[model samples]
Target: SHMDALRYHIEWNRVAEPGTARPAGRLLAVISPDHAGAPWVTAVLDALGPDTVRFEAKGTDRAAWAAQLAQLREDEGEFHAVVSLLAAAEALHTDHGSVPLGLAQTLLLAQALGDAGLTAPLWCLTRGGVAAGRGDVLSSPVQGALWGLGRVIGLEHPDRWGGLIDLPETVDTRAAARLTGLLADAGGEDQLAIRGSGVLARRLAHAAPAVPGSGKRPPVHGSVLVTGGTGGIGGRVARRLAEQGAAHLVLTSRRGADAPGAAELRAELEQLGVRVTIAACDAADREALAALLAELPEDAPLTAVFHSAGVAHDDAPVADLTLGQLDALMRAKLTAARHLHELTADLDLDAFVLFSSGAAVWGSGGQPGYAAANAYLDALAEHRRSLGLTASSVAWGTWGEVGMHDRLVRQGVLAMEPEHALGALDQMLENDDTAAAITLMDWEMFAPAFTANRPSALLSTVPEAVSALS
Candidate 1:
């Protein structure tokens, strides 16, 4: 209710395309092992000119990739830029799989590039990874994870970072030209999508204030599930839902009633004429989650889900991050969200809201794993909307007086008061907006730290950021 005036949507506004390629010097093209000889890579290579060299990754071998990159530089000398095709990895992950193979490989490639001391900027290519425009169906949410990873890489290694470019599904002549043009000279734009119409650049704009609806706002009457409902954010959400007239609130966490605020939260919620169930269950456990769903009472048959369960405990910079560390973070956010989505897709839920972080949206230097995990939630929400389901993912910044990242509030990155943050949440749910980024950014302070290594065309779009830079 309070922060609605400041709500912003992540929009892709079209910018004039770089008319032609600047003389791209010796280019290095890194293809996924499965797509080493794929025509699209070849087309991009051809457009990039004869000096381009191709290298196929050794399937998740970060150490080998690092050594190989080092040797390649030793033999051939420095390259102008590096392009990667690892985002086309959705076909490989199965029910018995780890994180998306493409996502892991991309991170490994980034880490290796850093390890090898290669200063060549890297541009990761993805097809169908982002719905950059209206009527655009995001075909691969798995590939979308790379966008999240790529953003963090921008902050952690801005000099080594290029930008993320989404290619047309069929990389025809015009598409190839656009891709090469960006690889040559991106005009400072980092996050971009290339469609036949032209190039679309990502920007964050304040949402136009809504014209209040005449009808009564939607009711919050059914059984609502809030994963991590015992945590700070979830506890806040549970109280809000109870206040909104939700008859039953299912609060879940690994520790259940033993969670620090669980007893107080349940007592408070129950006093508000609501039914409360604080269960000890990890939302990532399919069977446990399935059993929980089966136990929902007839009177309140699952009306809403607030997936706020996540941990930033194991995050590390991309260069120092291990696949093991990434897995731990993914299981909590991405994997847990996956299990929750599959288990609940058939239910008639009113809302499926995911709590994401700014780490995924704009990228934080040290939280690659957390960024990828939260980025999956954002992509999943888009994917669900494409299928005609109700879903919303909010990428939140720091909460001022509480929460895990409160430590960063001292750094002058604006921290949102809980009332303001939750009010923005209410507005998003009311407007039925598919995605929104709610954060009070002191861009003057943030831009300096973010661009300390390299100036970002990405931040050039935010007026405050531009002003800060000036």
Candidate 2:
């Protein structure tokens, strides 16, 4: 109860001065005014909380301090002040938007919604459900439609695609304008036009295989295996590889007749004169996987492997993460990838790609199992790369109707928060185009500031560790 009151106090302070240091441990004191009342000095830490202390002032008159230096020491405790802090960020971003501020606000908004227990993956819900769940933080349906604005259009400004989107429900004019500026720089006319043309071209752009310069070699033949070759991202990659006249394409998932994208991809590749095959096998079934690999043609060899199956579940808090779910996630990404590598070891392998996520690397509040699964996946990549395969892990950003975004919005999890959530959704969709993926270093460069010892743009942290293994 006291914590709730504390949240209210912090909320008031944040509304008053949104940019100030606000996470708990950063303190606040109430100061007496000469005539009428006291003001929340809202500046300087007077006491730390969740508990009271001898020196810790409790909303009572405390000596006024002009300097903030005395309040800077960290506390031994962790504070659950995220909800209020998030609200404040939402307010500030709305009033004073910019890319940096927008991103900070986005993190806070996601944290607050997560704390409120709005847990649903994006793929399963309909648009209507998405809007309703937004509740007070943002208005309904109008806010709901924003989830796909970035996906339906591109992230270009004042051009074919609508500019940076702002939800009318939580109009953050400042944040919106700021985001618009960043988009203007990053997603300008030329970039947006290229993305559009590439989207239309799809696999065609990838058709010209990345060739080494020499004028001496024909296009090299590469073969790839896509685990969830029927899902959105994986399927698309499989199709692209096939269209590129990959020497051989092996698409595997849980079902043959029911597998959505694989069969269609095989047909497309057949027209391109590429050999294509599909296998129905669950990642968890070692024997099935062995059977699938046993059937592969020994010719040409395996050059690439893409691990791309995942499930989004928000069943409980971190304290309640389940073993079964944990096993399932690992089976698909880590376990399956490992087994596949073993099966293909006799052949020449160029790249072993595993899917990871921003959530895993950055940490998300409600997605404990999903988050843990991804973190471990990264470690697995390092280990696999060590074994003579060019290992790479793609930390997917939010994507429309395919990866993370679809799990939340389309699937009917809680509605997304106002501008912060919407803006991230927009960025993810805009950035997820096949052409938009940044180099590994760029991904690390854009990582949240708190991240250290994580994958970097330079891969400097573990060049020997990763390169020698791959």
Candidate 3:
């Protein structure tokens, strides 16, 4: 068990004041249709001076956007920096399938910018995407999702990618200048939030270690639902719940009893004196989920939920990721989670654990869609906790015994042993943690390989990665 591996939490720390940069080349500012000629856009443009060129992204067609960007690059030679307001756009009900408009458009812009061979670092701007202080409120989680996607872009294209900056609701002259100054010289800070008080940079700090059963762990009683329960990771989780005194375990997956190894898991749990219900229900199908809940025995109503159903769409890089690919990836990970949250909110489930990925937390190079999907889970957990509900989203690294770990094992991203990872999960329950990342990573091996192409300011905070860089 790699339980001794590092424990981390996301925090915001104030940084030195930013100053405007005078670049030799022109600045390209991309905006969504809703913000066309908006005063804030004008303010930013005014602050950036005459070299800034404003381009409105009118639609979601990647090909058209790519061609447009290619043409712009041909016209402008090269940009000093590319700033996008697509992250601040409203979620459209009309286009881009299930992907939110703001996030989808941002992805398109990144992909299009890459397809056009534009090498200028790209920075995404959002509003209310982060809660920078104790009194702050995250007004828009959709914008927050952009930070996740942007982080992946930064990893995949370190040279071409800039960073994510959350803005205030209103961007006046001073705020616009602050934005311009940060865009000009970010001081190696990639993840940031600009508030009325000052600039805040996102950093990962060590979390106080948990003592398993230190605090009262939420009881594993009544019924527990594990989406993708028939799968390898979920099956393991189901077994753990059974071993912990769960009276009934409800395992959900598309194949149900027919899922490979389902019978074995069911028999094993039954032998442990826990009733098992393996149902062939697609978690993404809201109606199917509702039916499953209604059919639960009155005596063993759903008391906890562990959402582990997700697909890894890592085949394509951000530049080639199609909306269809993104839709499929998000269907299980995000759409299903939303449905589950809405339906189960009133149920007062003792635990709502979302199985997120390290890709979302730290940005994986080849899994933009997966990163975006899992990032939504993390944001969802934050939103749920804000509503005074029970929620915990875990961003897990590679597991030795689980699927996909073999493909990734060669990359120096160490695999965490299952027993140790589960031990960490037990501690999460004991501590009632809202979010956490559990993995055994030799950051020195992983970091140098990850940043072999270009440097990552985000990784500078990690001591091991810093040592490798030195």
TM-scores of the candidates in the order shown:
0.93, 0.43, 0.91
Q: What is the per-residue lDDT of model 2 for residues 70-109, given as tens digits with 9 covering 90 to 100?
A: 2311232322221111111111122222111212222222
* Candidate scoring better on lDDT of 2 and 3: 3
Query: Better model by TM-score, 2 or 3?
Result: 3
What ordering of candidates by lDDT runs from best to worst?
1, 3, 2
lDDT of 3 by residue, 171-240 (tens): 7666776787877788878888887788888876556777766656667899999999996789989999
Tell me the lDDT of candidate 3.
0.80
Task: List model 1 lDDT by residue over 1-470, tens digit each.
Answer: 34864477778879777757544478888877775565555666676767678788867888899999999999878888888888766554443254787788889999898889888999998877788977777776777888889998888787788999987767787887788788778888889898888899887677656545522247998789999999688899899999989999999999999999789889999999999999998888889999999999898899889998888997788888888888778887877888888988988667999999888887887888888888888989999988887888998888766567543554445778888888888878878888888888777788777777787766666788788778
Clashes of 1: 1
- Give every collision pair in model 3: none
List candidate 3 segments past 4 Å from native.
Answer: 1-6, 20-25, 34-51, 74-77, 90-96, 170-174, 212-216
The true-structure Cα RMSD of candidate 2 reads 21.0
Give the local distance difference test score of model 1.
Answer: 0.82
Q: Give me the candidate number with maximum TM-score.
A: 1
Candidate 1 accuracy as TM-score:
0.93
